């Protein structure tokens, strides 16, 4: 099946200049340790890992704390391609982008596994 079938909008996201406080809050709302980051035009920038914010002032920015700029798949990829990205990094949410690198959603690791349960029994 295709990635587009499994995309969700229900995932943790902040803008690149969000404060540490804001990022931590988003991750708490999703009970998770990853936040996907976009820039002001909606392009994908990378992800913030919770562990990287431990010793930061809450008022400071996440701008310099982004990681994994290469961790994404495209809308029109096969869900089998997402397997290769999750093998590289087992993050709970895999960013999904269009051809101009605009963030279009995410594939949750959970939903990816559900795809594999279907593609098999």
PDB file of C-alpha atoms in Angstrom, residues 11-118:
ATOM      1  CA  UNK A  11       0.946  14.153  15.864  1.00  0.00           C
ATOM      2  CA  UNK A  12       3.235  16.484  17.880  1.00  0.00           C
ATOM      3  CA  UNK A  13       4.428  19.500  15.846  1.00  0.00           C
ATOM      4  CA  UNK A  14       6.072  22.862  16.604  1.00  0.00           C
ATOM      5  CA  UNK A  15       7.588  25.698  14.578  1.00  0.00           C
ATOM      6  CA  UNK A  16      11.406  26.072  14.508  1.00  0.00           C
ATOM      7  CA  UNK A  17      11.465  29.052  16.940  1.00  0.00           C
ATOM      8  CA  UNK A  18       9.112  27.518  19.505  1.00  0.00           C
ATOM      9  CA  UNK A  19      10.289  27.760  23.106  1.00  0.00           C
ATOM     10  CA  UNK A  20      11.485  24.722  25.038  1.00  0.00           C
ATOM     11  CA  UNK A  21       8.375  25.089  27.270  1.00  0.00           C
ATOM     12  CA  UNK A  22       6.069  24.881  24.227  1.00  0.00           C
ATOM     13  CA  UNK A  23       7.849  21.849  22.788  1.00  0.00           C
ATOM     14  CA  UNK A  24       7.754  19.987  26.095  1.00  0.00           C
ATOM     15  CA  UNK A  25       4.040  20.726  26.395  1.00  0.00           C
ATOM     16  CA  UNK A  26       3.251  19.336  22.908  1.00  0.00           C
ATOM     17  CA  UNK A  27       5.162  16.125  23.698  1.00  0.00           C
ATOM     18  CA  UNK A  28       3.210  15.788  26.986  1.00  0.00           C
ATOM     19  CA  UNK A  29      -0.100  16.171  25.098  1.00  0.00           C
ATOM     20  CA  UNK A  30       0.897  13.256  22.848  1.00  0.00           C
ATOM     21  CA  UNK A  31       2.520  11.337  25.728  1.00  0.00           C
ATOM     22  CA  UNK A  32       5.684  11.057  23.684  1.00  0.00           C
ATOM     23  CA  UNK A  33       9.400  12.076  23.439  1.00  0.00           C
ATOM     24  CA  UNK A  34       9.499  13.381  19.823  1.00  0.00           C
ATOM     25  CA  UNK A  35       8.217  16.617  18.239  1.00  0.00           C
ATOM     26  CA  UNK A  36       8.227  17.211  14.477  1.00  0.00           C
ATOM     27  CA  UNK A  37       9.443  20.690  13.471  1.00  0.00           C
ATOM     28  CA  UNK A  38       8.500  22.897  10.522  1.00  0.00           C
ATOM     29  CA  UNK A  39       9.686  26.325   9.431  1.00  0.00           C
ATOM     30  CA  UNK A  40       7.454  29.402   8.889  1.00  0.00           C
ATOM     31  CA  UNK A  41       6.587  28.363   5.302  1.00  0.00           C
ATOM     32  CA  UNK A  42       5.500  24.878   6.464  1.00  0.00           C
ATOM     33  CA  UNK A  43       8.599  23.007   5.259  1.00  0.00           C
ATOM     34  CA  UNK A  44       9.942  20.069   7.210  1.00  0.00           C
ATOM     35  CA  UNK A  45      13.031  20.883   9.340  1.00  0.00           C
ATOM     36  CA  UNK A  46      13.624  17.816  11.524  1.00  0.00           C
ATOM     37  CA  UNK A  47      12.562  16.486  14.873  1.00  0.00           C
ATOM     38  CA  UNK A  48      13.272  17.455  18.488  1.00  0.00           C
ATOM     39  CA  UNK A  49      14.049  14.607  20.919  1.00  0.00           C
ATOM     40  CA  UNK A  50      12.901  15.214  24.565  1.00  0.00           C
ATOM     41  CA  UNK A  51      16.257  14.135  26.043  1.00  0.00           C
ATOM     42  CA  UNK A  52      17.945  17.016  24.198  1.00  0.00           C
ATOM     43  CA  UNK A  53      15.864  19.602  26.140  1.00  0.00           C
ATOM     44  CA  UNK A  54      16.649  18.385  29.694  1.00  0.00           C
ATOM     45  CA  UNK A  55      19.178  21.060  30.707  1.00  0.00           C
ATOM     46  CA  UNK A  56      17.657  24.020  28.840  1.00  0.00           C
ATOM     47  CA  UNK A  57      15.931  27.152  30.157  1.00  0.00           C
ATOM     48  CA  UNK A  58      12.185  26.864  29.431  1.00  0.00           C
ATOM     49  CA  UNK A  59      12.168  30.292  27.745  1.00  0.00           C
ATOM     50  CA  UNK A  60      14.954  29.346  25.311  1.00  0.00           C
ATOM     51  CA  UNK A  61      14.302  28.306  21.689  1.00  0.00           C
ATOM     52  CA  UNK A  62      14.408  24.843  20.085  1.00  0.00           C
ATOM     53  CA  UNK A  63      15.975  26.440  16.957  1.00  0.00           C
ATOM     54  CA  UNK A  64      19.446  24.926  17.501  1.00  0.00           C
ATOM     55  CA  UNK A  65      18.128  21.649  18.980  1.00  0.00           C
ATOM     56  CA  UNK A  66      16.589  20.088  15.832  1.00  0.00           C
ATOM     57  CA  UNK A  67      17.819  16.662  14.733  1.00  0.00           C
ATOM     58  CA  UNK A  68      17.315  14.225  11.816  1.00  0.00           C
ATOM     59  CA  UNK A  69      16.765  16.558   8.847  1.00  0.00           C
ATOM     60  CA  UNK A  70      16.824  13.465   6.556  1.00  0.00           C
ATOM     61  CA  UNK A  71      14.109  11.530   8.458  1.00  0.00           C
ATOM     62  CA  UNK A  72      11.067  11.721   6.186  1.00  0.00           C
ATOM     63  CA  UNK A  73       9.149   9.968   3.417  1.00  0.00           C
ATOM     64  CA  UNK A  74       7.095  11.425   0.522  1.00  0.00           C
ATOM     65  CA  UNK A  75       3.286  11.217   0.208  1.00  0.00           C
ATOM     66  CA  UNK A  76       3.507   9.040  -2.909  1.00  0.00           C
ATOM     67  CA  UNK A  77       6.030   6.522  -1.528  1.00  0.00           C
ATOM     68  CA  UNK A  78       5.136   2.934  -0.756  1.00  0.00           C
ATOM     69  CA  UNK A  79       4.531   2.116   2.891  1.00  0.00           C
ATOM     70  CA  UNK A  80       7.272  -0.541   2.426  1.00  0.00           C
ATOM     71  CA  UNK A  81       9.708   2.390   1.964  1.00  0.00           C
ATOM     72  CA  UNK A  82       8.835   3.685   5.460  1.00  0.00           C
ATOM     73  CA  UNK A  83      10.283   0.384   6.759  1.00  0.00           C
ATOM     74  CA  UNK A  84      13.713   1.562   5.653  1.00  0.00           C
ATOM     75  CA  UNK A  85      13.365   4.888   7.544  1.00  0.00           C
ATOM     76  CA  UNK A  86      12.101   3.213  10.753  1.00  0.00           C
ATOM     77  CA  UNK A  87      15.075   0.816  10.536  1.00  0.00           C
ATOM     78  CA  UNK A  88      17.330   3.896  10.518  1.00  0.00           C
ATOM     79  CA  UNK A  89      15.467   5.612  13.412  1.00  0.00           C
ATOM     80  CA  UNK A  90      12.658   4.088  15.546  1.00  0.00           C
ATOM     81  CA  UNK A  91      10.859   7.373  16.201  1.00  0.00           C
ATOM     82  CA  UNK A  92       7.126   7.225  17.052  1.00  0.00           C
ATOM     83  CA  UNK A  93       6.240   9.544  14.160  1.00  0.00           C
ATOM     84  CA  UNK A  94       7.728   9.587  10.660  1.00  0.00           C
ATOM     85  CA  UNK A  95       7.408  12.946   8.854  1.00  0.00           C
ATOM     86  CA  UNK A  96       5.599  12.932   5.478  1.00  0.00           C
ATOM     87  CA  UNK A  97       6.379  15.603   2.907  1.00  0.00           C
ATOM     88  CA  UNK A  98       5.389  16.713  -0.607  1.00  0.00           C
ATOM     89  CA  UNK A  99       7.772  17.378  -3.500  1.00  0.00           C
ATOM     90  CA  UNK A 100       8.716  20.843  -2.186  1.00  0.00           C
ATOM     91  CA  UNK A 101       9.511  19.425   1.280  1.00  0.00           C
ATOM     92  CA  UNK A 102       6.312  20.866   2.820  1.00  0.00           C
ATOM     93  CA  UNK A 103       5.156  18.900   5.859  1.00  0.00           C
ATOM     94  CA  UNK A 104       1.884  17.100   4.986  1.00  0.00           C
ATOM     95  CA  UNK A 105       1.470  14.900   8.092  1.00  0.00           C
ATOM     96  CA  UNK A 106       3.133  11.923   9.734  1.00  0.00           C
ATOM     97  CA  UNK A 107       2.978   8.137   9.753  1.00  0.00           C
ATOM     98  CA  UNK A 108       2.886   6.862  13.335  1.00  0.00           C
ATOM     99  CA  UNK A 109       5.053   3.824  14.074  1.00  0.00           C
ATOM    100  CA  UNK A 110       1.864   2.230  15.448  1.00  0.00           C
ATOM    101  CA  UNK A 111      -0.018   2.793  12.178  1.00  0.00           C
ATOM    102  CA  UNK A 112       2.955   1.517  10.182  1.00  0.00           C
ATOM    103  CA  UNK A 113       2.865  -1.728  12.169  1.00  0.00           C
ATOM    104  CA  UNK A 114      -0.894  -1.957  11.540  1.00  0.00           C
ATOM    105  CA  UNK A 115      -0.092  -1.700   7.810  1.00  0.00           C
ATOM    106  CA  UNK A 116       2.303  -4.673   8.164  1.00  0.00           C
ATOM    107  CA  UNK A 117      -0.307  -6.642  10.117  1.00  0.00           C
ATOM    108  CA  UNK A 118      -2.638  -6.175   7.143  1.00  0.00           C
TER     109      UNK A 118
END
